[PDB]
Amino acid sequence: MISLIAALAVDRVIGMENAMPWNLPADLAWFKRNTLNKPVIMGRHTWESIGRPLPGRKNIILSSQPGTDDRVTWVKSVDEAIAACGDVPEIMVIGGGRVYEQFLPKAQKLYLTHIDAEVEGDTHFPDYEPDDWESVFSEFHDADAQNSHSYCFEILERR
Numbered sequence: 001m002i003s004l005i006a007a008l009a010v011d012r013v014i015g016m017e018n019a020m021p022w023n024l025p026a027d028l029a030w031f032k033r034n035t036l037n038k039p040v041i042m043g044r045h046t047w048e049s050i051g052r053p054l055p056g057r058k059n060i061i062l063s064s065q066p067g068t069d070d071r072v073t074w075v076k077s078v079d080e081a082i083a084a085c086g087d088v089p090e091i092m093v094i095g096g097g098r099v100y101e102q103f104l105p106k107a108q109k110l111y112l113t114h115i116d117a118e119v120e121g122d123t124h125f126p127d128y129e130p131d132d133w134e135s136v137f138s139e140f141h142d143a144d145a146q147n148s149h150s151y152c153f154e155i156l157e158r159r
């Protein structure tokens, strides 16, 4: 199965991390947990923001342009990325904008972290119709000493 894991701001705004409101430690741990030991598919820029391959995980980069790092797998096609993951229980799509919008049609599960913070941004998350996504889990968390704004974890599944 294919899953997307994203962190969304107000108005479903998607964004490159490293800092911003997406460096939230507790969200990083939610990500690291759900993304541990599963093959990981990203974009160019989402790969640039990590700087290192995510360990114990095949890392796949969807890019129209050629590879610049042998520690990871570069592919050009959505279907090449899926195949490059082998036969695994769950594939994890990491971002960003263009990569989410390419993989939504084939995904069965969403791992959304809604953050209660606003960013002026022109990149958004794909508009999923609630008529084909069931909320299977939400976990609100207050603003914390390490977490600048509150945040709500959510899992959704296609019906």
Ligand SMILES: Nc1nc(N)c2c(ccc3c2ccn3Cc2ccccc2F)n1
Pocket (backbone or CB within 6 Å): 005, 006, 007, 017, 018, 022, 027, 028, 031, 046, 049, 050, 093, 094, 095, 111, 112, 113
């Ligand atoms: N909910 C949700 N979803 C996501 N795809 C991410 C995330 C938080 C950080 C993310 C995501 C994707 C890439 N990074 C940057 C990064 C990840 C791991 C280590 C170092 C790093 F810089 N949170």
